[PDB]
Structures are given as C-alpha cells and as structure tokens.
mmCIF file of C-alpha atoms and ligand atoms in Angstrom:
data_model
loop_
_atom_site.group_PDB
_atom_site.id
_atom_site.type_symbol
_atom_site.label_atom_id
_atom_site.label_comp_id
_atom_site.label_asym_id
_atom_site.label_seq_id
_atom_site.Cartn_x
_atom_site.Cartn_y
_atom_site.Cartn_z
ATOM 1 C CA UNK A 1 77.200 10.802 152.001
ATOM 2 C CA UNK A 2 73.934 10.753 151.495
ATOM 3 C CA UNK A 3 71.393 12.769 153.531
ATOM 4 C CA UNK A 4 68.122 11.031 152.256
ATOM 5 C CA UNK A 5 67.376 7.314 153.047
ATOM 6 C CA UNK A 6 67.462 4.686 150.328
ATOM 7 C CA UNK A 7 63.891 3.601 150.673
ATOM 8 C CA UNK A 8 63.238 7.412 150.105
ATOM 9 C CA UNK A 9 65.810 7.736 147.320
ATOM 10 C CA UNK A 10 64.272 4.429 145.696
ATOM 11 C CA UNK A 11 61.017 6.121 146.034
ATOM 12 C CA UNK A 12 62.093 9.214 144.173
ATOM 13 C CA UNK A 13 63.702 7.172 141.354
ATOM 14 C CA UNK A 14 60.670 4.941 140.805
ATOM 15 C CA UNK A 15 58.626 8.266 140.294
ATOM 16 C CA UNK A 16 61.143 9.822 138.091
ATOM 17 C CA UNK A 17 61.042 6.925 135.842
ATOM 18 C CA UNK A 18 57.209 6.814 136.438
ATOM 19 C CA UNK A 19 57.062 10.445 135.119
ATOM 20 C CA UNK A 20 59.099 8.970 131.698
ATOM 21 C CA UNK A 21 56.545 6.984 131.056
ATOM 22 C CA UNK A 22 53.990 9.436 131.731
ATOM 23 C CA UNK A 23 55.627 11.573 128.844
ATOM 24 C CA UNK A 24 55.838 8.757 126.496
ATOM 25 C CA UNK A 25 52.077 7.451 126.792
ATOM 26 C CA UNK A 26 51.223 11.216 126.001
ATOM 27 C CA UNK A 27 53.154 10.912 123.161
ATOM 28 C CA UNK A 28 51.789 8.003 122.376
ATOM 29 C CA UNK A 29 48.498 9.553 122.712
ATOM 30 C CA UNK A 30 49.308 12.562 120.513
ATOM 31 C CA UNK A 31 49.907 9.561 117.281
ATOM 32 C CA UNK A 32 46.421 8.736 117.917
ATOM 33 C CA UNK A 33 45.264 12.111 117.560
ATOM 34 C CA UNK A 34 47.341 12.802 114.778
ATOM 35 C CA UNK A 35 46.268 9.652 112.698
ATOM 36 C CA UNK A 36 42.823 10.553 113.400
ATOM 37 C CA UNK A 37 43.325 14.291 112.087
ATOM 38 C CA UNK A 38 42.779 16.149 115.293
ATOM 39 C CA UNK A 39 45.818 18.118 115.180
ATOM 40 C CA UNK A 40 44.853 19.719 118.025
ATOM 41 C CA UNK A 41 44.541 17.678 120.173
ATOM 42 C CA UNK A 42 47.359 15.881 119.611
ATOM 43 C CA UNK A 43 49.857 19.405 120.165
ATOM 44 C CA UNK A 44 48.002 19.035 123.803
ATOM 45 C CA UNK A 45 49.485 15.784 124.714
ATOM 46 C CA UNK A 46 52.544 16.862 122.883
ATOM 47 C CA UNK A 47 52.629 19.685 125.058
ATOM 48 C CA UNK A 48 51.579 18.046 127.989
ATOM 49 C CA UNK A 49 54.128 15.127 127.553
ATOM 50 C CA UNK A 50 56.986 18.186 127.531
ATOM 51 C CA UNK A 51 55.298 19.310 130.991
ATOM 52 C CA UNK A 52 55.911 15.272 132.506
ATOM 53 C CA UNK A 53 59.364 15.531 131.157
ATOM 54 C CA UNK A 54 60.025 18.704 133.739
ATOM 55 C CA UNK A 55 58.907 16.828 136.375
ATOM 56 C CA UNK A 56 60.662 13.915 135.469
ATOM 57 C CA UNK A 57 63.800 16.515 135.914
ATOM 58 C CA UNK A 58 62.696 17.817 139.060
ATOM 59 C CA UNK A 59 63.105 14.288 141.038
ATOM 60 C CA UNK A 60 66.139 13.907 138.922
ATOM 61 C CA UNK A 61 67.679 17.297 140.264
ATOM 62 C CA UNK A 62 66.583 16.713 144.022
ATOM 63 C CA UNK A 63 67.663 13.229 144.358
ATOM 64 C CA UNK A 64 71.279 15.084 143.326
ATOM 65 C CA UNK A 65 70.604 18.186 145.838
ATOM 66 C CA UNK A 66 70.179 15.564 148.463
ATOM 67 C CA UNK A 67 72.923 13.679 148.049
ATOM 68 C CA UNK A 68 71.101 10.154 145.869
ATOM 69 C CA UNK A 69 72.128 8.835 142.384
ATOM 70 C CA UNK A 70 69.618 8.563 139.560
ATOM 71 C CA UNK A 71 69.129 5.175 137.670
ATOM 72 C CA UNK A 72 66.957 4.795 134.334
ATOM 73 C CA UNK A 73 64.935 2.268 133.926
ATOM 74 C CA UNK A 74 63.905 0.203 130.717
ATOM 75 C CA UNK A 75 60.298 1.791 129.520
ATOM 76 C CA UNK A 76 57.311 -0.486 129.254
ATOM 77 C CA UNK A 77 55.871 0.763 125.617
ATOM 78 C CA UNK A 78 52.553 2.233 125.923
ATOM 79 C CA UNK A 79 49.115 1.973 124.016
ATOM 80 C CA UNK A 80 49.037 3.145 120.776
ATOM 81 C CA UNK A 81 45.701 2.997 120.034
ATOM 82 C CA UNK A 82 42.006 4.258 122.093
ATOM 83 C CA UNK A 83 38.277 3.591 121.095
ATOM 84 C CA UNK A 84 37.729 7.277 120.220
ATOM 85 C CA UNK A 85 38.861 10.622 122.133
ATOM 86 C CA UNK A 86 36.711 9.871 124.919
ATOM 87 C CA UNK A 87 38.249 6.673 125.360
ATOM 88 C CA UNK A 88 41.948 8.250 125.323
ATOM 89 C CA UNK A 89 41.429 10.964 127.794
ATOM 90 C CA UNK A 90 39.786 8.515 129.812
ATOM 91 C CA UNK A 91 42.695 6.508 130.021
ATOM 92 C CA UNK A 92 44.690 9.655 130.430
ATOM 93 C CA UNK A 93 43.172 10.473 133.708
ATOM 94 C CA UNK A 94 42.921 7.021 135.207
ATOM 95 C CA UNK A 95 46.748 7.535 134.320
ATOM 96 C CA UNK A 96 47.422 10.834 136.312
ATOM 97 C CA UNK A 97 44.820 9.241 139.187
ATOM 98 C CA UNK A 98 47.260 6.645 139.243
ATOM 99 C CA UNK A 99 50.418 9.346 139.133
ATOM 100 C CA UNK A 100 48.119 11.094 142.079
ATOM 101 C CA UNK A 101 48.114 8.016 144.190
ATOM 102 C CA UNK A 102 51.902 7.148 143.894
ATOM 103 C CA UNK A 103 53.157 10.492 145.212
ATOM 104 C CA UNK A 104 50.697 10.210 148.083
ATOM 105 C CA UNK A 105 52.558 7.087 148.919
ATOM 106 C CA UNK A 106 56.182 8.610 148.822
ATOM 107 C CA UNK A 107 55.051 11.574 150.979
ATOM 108 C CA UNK A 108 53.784 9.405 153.963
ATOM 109 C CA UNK A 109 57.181 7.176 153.317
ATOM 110 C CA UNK A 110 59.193 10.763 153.569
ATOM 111 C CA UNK A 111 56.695 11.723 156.521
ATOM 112 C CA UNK A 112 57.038 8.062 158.465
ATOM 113 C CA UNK A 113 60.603 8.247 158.260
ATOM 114 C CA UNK A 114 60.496 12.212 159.310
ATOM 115 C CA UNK A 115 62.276 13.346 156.275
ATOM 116 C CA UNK A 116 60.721 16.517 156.450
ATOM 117 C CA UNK A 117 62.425 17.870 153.623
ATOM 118 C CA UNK A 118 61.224 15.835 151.186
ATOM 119 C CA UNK A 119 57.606 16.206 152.364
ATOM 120 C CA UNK A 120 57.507 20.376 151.378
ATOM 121 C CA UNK A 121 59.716 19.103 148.234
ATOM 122 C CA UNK A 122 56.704 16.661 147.769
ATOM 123 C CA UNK A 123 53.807 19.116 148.361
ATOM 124 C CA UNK A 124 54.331 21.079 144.998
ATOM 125 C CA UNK A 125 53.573 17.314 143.197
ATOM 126 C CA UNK A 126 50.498 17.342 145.025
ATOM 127 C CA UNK A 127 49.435 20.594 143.893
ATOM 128 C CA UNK A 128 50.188 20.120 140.506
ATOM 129 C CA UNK A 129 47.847 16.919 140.442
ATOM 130 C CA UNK A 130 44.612 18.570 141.765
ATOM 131 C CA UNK A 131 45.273 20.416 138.125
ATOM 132 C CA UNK A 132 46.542 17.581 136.044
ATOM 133 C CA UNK A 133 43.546 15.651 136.858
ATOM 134 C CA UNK A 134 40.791 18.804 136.387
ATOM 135 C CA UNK A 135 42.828 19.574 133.382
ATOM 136 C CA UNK A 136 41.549 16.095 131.686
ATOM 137 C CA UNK A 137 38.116 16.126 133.797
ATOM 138 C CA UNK A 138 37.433 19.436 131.620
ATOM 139 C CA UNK A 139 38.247 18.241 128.520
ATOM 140 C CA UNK A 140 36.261 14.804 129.063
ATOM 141 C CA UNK A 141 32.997 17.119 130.178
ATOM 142 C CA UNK A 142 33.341 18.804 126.920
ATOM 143 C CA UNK A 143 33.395 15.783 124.796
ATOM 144 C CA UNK A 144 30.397 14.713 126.758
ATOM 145 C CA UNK A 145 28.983 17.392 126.115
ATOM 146 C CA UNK A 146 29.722 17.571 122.571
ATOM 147 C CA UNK A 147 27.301 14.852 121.988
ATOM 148 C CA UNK A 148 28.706 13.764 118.920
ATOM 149 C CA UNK A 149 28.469 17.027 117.300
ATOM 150 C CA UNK A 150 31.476 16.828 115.320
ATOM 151 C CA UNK A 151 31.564 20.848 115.063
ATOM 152 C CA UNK A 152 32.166 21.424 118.675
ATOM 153 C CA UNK A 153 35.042 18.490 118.632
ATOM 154 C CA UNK A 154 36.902 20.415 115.910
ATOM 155 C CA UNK A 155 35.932 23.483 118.187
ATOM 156 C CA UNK A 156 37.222 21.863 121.016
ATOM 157 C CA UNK A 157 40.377 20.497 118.755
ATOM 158 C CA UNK A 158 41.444 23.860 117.914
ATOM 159 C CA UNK A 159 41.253 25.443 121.425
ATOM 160 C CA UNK A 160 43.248 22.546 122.620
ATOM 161 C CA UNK A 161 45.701 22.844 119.618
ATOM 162 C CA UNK A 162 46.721 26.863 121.280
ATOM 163 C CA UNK A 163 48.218 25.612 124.591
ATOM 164 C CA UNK A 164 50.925 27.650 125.316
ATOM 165 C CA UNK B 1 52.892 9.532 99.296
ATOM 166 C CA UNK B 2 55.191 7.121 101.315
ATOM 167 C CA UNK B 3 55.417 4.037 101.068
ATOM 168 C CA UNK B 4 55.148 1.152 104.408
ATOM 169 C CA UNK B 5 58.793 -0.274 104.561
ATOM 170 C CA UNK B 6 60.289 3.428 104.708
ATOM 171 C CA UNK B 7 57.759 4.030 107.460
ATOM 172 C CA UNK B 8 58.914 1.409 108.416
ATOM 173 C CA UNK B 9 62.053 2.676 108.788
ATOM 174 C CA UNK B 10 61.424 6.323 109.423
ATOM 175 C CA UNK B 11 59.541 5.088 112.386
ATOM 176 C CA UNK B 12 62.416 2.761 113.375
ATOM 177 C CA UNK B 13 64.823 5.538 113.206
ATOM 178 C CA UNK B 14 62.165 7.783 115.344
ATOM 179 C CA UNK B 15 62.576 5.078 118.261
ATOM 180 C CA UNK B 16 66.370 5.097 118.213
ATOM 181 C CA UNK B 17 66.543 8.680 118.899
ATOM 182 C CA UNK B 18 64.206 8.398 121.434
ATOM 183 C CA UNK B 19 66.830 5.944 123.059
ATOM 184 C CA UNK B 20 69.390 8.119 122.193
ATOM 185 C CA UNK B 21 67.802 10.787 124.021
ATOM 186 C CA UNK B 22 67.600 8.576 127.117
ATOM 187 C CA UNK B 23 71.466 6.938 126.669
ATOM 188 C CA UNK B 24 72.538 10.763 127.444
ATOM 189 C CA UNK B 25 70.052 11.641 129.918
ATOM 190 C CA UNK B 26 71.925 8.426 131.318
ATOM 191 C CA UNK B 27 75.232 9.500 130.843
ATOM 192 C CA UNK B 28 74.276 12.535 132.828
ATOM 193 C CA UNK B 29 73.311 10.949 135.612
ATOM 194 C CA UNK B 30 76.788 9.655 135.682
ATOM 195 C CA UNK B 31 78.600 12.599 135.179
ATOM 196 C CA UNK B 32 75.815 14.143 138.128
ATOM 197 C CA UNK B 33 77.109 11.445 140.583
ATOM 198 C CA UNK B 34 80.735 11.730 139.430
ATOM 199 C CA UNK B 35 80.519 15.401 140.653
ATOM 200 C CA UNK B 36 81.263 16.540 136.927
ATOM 201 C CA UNK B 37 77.939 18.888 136.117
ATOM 202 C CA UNK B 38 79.860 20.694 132.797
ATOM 203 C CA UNK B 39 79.539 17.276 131.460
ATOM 204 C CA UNK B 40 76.234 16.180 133.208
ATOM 205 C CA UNK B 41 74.963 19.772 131.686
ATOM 206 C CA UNK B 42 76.072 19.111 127.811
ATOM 207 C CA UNK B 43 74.598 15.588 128.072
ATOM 208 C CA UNK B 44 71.250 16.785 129.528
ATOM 209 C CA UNK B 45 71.532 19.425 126.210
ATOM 210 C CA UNK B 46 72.273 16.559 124.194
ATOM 211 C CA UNK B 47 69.587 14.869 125.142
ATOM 212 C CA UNK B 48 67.050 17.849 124.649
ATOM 213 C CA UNK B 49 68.450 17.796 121.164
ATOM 214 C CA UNK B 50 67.906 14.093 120.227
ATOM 215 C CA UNK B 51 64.262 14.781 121.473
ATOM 216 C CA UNK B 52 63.989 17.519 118.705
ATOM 217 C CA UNK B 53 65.536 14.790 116.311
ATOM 218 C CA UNK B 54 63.083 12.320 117.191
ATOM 219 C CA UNK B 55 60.008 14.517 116.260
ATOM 220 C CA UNK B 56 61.744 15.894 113.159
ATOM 221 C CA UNK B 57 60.945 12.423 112.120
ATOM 222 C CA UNK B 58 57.376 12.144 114.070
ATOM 223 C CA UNK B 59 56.266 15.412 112.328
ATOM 224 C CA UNK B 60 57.566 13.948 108.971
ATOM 225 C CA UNK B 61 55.825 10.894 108.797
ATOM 226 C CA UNK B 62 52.429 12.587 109.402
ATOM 227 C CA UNK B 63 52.943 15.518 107.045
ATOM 228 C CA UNK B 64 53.521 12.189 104.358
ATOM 229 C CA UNK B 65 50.798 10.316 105.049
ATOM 230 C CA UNK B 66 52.060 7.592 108.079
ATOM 231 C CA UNK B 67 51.395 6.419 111.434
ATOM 232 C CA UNK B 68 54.136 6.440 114.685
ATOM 233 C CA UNK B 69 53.869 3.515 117.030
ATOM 234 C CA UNK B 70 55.844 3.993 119.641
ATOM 235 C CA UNK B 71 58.391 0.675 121.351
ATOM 236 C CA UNK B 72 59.766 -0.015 124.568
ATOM 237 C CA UNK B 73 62.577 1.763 125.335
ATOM 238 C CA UNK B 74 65.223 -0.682 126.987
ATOM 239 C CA UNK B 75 67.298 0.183 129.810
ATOM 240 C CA UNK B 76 70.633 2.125 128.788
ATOM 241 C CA UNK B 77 73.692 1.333 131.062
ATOM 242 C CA UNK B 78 74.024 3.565 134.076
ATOM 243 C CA UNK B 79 78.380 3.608 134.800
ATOM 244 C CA UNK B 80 81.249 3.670 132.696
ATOM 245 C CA UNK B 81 85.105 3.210 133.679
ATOM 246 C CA UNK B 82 85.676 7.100 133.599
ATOM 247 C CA UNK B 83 84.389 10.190 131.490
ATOM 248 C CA UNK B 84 86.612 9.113 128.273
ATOM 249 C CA UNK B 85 85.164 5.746 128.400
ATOM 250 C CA UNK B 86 81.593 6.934 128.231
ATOM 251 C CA UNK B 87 82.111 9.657 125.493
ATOM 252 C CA UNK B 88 83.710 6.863 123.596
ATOM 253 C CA UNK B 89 80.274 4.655 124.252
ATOM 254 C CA UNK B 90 78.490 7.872 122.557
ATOM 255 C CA UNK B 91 80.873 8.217 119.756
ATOM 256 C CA UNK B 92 80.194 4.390 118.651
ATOM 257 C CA UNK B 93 76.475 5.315 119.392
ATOM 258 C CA UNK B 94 76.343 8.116 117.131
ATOM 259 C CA UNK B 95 78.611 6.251 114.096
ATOM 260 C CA UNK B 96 75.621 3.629 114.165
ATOM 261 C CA UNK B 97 72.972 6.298 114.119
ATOM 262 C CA UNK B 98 74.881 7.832 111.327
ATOM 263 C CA UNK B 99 74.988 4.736 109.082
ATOM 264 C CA UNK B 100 71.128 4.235 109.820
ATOM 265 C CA UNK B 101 70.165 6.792 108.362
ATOM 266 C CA UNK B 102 72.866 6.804 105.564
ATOM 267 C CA UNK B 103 71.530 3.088 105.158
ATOM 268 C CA UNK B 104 67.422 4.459 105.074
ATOM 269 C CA UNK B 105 68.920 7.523 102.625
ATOM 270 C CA UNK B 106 69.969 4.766 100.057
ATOM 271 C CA UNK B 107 66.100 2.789 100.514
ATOM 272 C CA UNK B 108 64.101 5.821 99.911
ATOM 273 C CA UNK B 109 66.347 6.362 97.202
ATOM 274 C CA UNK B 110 65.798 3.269 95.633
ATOM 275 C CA UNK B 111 62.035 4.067 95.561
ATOM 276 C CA UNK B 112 62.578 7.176 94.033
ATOM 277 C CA UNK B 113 60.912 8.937 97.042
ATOM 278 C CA UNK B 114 62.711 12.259 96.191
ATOM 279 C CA UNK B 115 61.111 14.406 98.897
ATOM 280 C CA UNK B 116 62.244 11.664 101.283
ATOM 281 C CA UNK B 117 65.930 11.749 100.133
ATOM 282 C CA UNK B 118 65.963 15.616 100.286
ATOM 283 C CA UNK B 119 64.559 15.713 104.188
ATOM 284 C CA UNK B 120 67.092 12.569 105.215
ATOM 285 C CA UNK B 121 69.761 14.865 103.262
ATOM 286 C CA UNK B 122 68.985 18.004 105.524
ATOM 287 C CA UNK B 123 70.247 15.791 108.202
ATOM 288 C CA UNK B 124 72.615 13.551 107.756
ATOM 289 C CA UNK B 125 74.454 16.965 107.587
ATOM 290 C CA UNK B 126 73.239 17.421 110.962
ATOM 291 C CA UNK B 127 74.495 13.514 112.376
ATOM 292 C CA UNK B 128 77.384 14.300 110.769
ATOM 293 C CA UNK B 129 78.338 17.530 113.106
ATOM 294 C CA UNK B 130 76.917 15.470 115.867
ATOM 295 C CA UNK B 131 79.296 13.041 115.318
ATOM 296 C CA UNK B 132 81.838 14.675 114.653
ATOM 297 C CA UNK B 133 81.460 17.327 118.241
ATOM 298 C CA UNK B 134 81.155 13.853 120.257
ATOM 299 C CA UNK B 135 84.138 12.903 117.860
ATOM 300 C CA UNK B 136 86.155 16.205 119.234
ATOM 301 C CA UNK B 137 85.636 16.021 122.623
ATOM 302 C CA UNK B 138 87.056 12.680 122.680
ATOM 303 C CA UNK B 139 90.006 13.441 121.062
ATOM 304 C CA UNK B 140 90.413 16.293 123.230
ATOM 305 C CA UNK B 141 90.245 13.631 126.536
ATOM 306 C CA UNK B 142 92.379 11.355 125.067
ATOM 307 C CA UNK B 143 94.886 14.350 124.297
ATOM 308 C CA UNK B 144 93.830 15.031 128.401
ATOM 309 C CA UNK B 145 95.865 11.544 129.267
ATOM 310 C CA UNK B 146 94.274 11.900 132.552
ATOM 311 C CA UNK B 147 95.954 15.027 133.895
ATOM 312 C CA UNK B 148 92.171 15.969 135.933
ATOM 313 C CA UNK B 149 93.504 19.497 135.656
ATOM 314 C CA UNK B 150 92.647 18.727 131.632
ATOM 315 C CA UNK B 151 89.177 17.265 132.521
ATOM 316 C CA UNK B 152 88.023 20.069 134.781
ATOM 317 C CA UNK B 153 88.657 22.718 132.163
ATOM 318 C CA UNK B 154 86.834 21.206 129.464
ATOM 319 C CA UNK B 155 83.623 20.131 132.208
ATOM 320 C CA UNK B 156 83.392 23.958 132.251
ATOM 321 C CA UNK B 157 83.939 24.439 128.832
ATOM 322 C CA UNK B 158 81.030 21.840 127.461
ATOM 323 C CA UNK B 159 78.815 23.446 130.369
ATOM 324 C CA UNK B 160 78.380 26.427 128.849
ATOM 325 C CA UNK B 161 76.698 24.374 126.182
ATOM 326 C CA UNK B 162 73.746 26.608 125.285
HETATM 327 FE FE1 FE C 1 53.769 14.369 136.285
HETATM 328 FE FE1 FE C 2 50.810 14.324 134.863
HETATM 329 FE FE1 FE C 3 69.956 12.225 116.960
HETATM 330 FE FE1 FE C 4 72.029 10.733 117.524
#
C-alpha cells in the first residue's frame, strides 16, 4: 500500500528534487566565490549546499516511511555567475523565499486532505526556514554595512569560512 | 599553471561524477521501493563517495588556477529488471568513468602537465577499486542465479557498508 495520497507523495518528490537543486545552485555559488578569492565564503555555500542535501534525504526517507516511491528528476543547471557578493546572496535568499513558499503550499495540501502526519513531519521545514532566510538576511546586512570597505569583507570572508 | 582544454576536461569529468552521484542515489531509490535497504544503504554510500570524487576535482582546479561551471544534470533512469540488472548498469557506468579519466591522464600527459598526471594517477587507483567492488558484487549475483536466499545475505552484507 501506500498510506499517503499521490498528490501528497507528488508534493514531497517535487520538494525533494527542489532541495537538489537548492544544493547545486549553492555549489554553484561557492565557484563564484572561489574564482573571486573569497575562500570563505565560498566553504559557506559549500557547507550550506551539504545542509540542502540532508533535507533533500529527509523527504527521501519519509516518502519511504510512508509507504511512496522516490523519482529523480533531470536538474535545471544553475547560474554560475552574480554581479558581486551582494548580488549572490541576494539571489540566495530570493531562492530560500522561494523554498519558504513551496513548503507552505505542501503543508495546506497535507492539511486540506487531513494528512495530519505529514503536517508535524512538515512543521520542522518551516522552522528551519525562519533560519535559512535570517541566516542570508545577516550576511546581506553585513555587506551593506561593509560599505565597500574591503577589510571588513575579508573580515566577514573569514568568519564565514569557520562554519562548522 | 593549467592549461583551458584540461579544464576543460577536469571540469567535464567534475560533472560526470556529479551524475554519478545521482545514478546511485537513483539506484537506491530502487532498491528502497524493492524492499532491499542493504542495497539501497551501499548505494546511498556510494553516492556520498562520488560526491567526495567530484570535489577532489572542484578543489583541484582552483588550487591550479581554473574556474568550475557547473551543467544540467539529466535525469538518470529510475527501474531496472532486478538487482543484477542494475549493478550491471553501474558496472558499465563505472568502466566509462574509468576510461575518462585514463583518456584525460594521457592529455595532460601530452602537455607535460606533470602535477596533473601525478593527482589523475592518485586516482585512477581509486576508479580502479571502484570498479572493480561494483565488478565483485556482480559476480557474486550472477554466482546468486536467483536463489533470493543468495540476494538477502549479501543486502545485509553491502549494508554494513560503512
Ligand atoms: Fe532546504
Ligand atoms: Fe535552504
Ligand atoms: Fe567517482
Ligand atoms: Fe565513478
């Protein structure tokens, strides 16, 4: 059997995949970075494109718990290239915004269709954005703040470049 | 240091193992809906690995001088006619991968991009075992027939895969 719905199971898959992508544009992020010497901030995105990749795996291992297949989808390639750091962690949260937005939409699906179960499953996703998207907001304040002083940047850089 | 056409293909090979990565995450969710998790469990390690691989070559390219850009990734099949059919799908996987980066080996070579040769030689030692374990466990299911009695004991052998 299967003890989730299939517009609930489709749901789940198209975030799973959605969370792939979400790992590679980070990635792709982090060859910006790294082209452009900031080292630092590129083992952020490389770190934070490990993080997607867990909750990529989470869908995957609850669709199985509940009784669903899993089914990969081809992966649109991302930007390569920003106008600036600004201009990528911009993008960046616009992204997880976007992320936000979509697992909004599968927990009223799960909660119109009183699958109850996969609203509490849902609820640690919505936690988990509030941070993704202050993560970014507090690195794009910084920048501002920076000015252009290219000091506090490589300041920044190397704070970013200890996440654990 | 490094020249374009072997970042070229150092970044070429960088995008196959990301595939790779995502043909066993694939395979895995095969073996998941096939009720065999030993197997779905080695080919979700397998594909942790060929992540590792993948930025191996990322992290080489930048310490020598060169730029990633990263491609679409296209869809890898989903089913296979049985677990033997899908290990041998991985074993003709990995013999390409192999002779990639046998066939970039003999281009940096040509160069004389020595530092290049001597990282592609750490791991084309590496393909080779990876080959060669995909190689095994084949063998081993073809020794299986089909006897499932055969299957199940090597699903919990490969899922203790560390
Ligand atoms: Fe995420
Ligand atoms: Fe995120
Ligand atoms: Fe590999
Ligand atoms: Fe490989």
């Amino acid at each position: 059997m299967m003890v989730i719905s299939e517009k609930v199971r489709k749901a789940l898959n198209d975030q799973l995949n959605r969370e792939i992508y979400s790992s590679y544009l980070y990635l792709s992020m982090a060859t910006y970075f790294d082209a452009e010497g900031f080292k630092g901030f590129a083992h952020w995105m490389k770190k934070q494109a490990q993080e997607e990749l867990t909750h990529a795996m989470k869908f995957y291992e609850y669709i199985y718990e509940r009784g669903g297949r899993v089914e990969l989808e081809a992966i649109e390639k991302p930007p390569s290239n920003w106008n600036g750091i600004k201009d990528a962690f911009e993008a960046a949260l616009k992204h997880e915004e976007f992320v936000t937005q979509s697992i909004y939409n599968i927990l009223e699906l799960a909660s119109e269709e009183k699958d109850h179960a996969t609203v509490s499953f849902l609820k640690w996703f919505v936690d988990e954005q509030v941070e993704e998207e202050d993560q970014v907001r507090e690195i794009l304040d910084l920048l501002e703040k920076a000015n252009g002083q290219m000091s506090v940047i490589f300041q920044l850089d190397r704070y970013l470049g200890q996440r654990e």
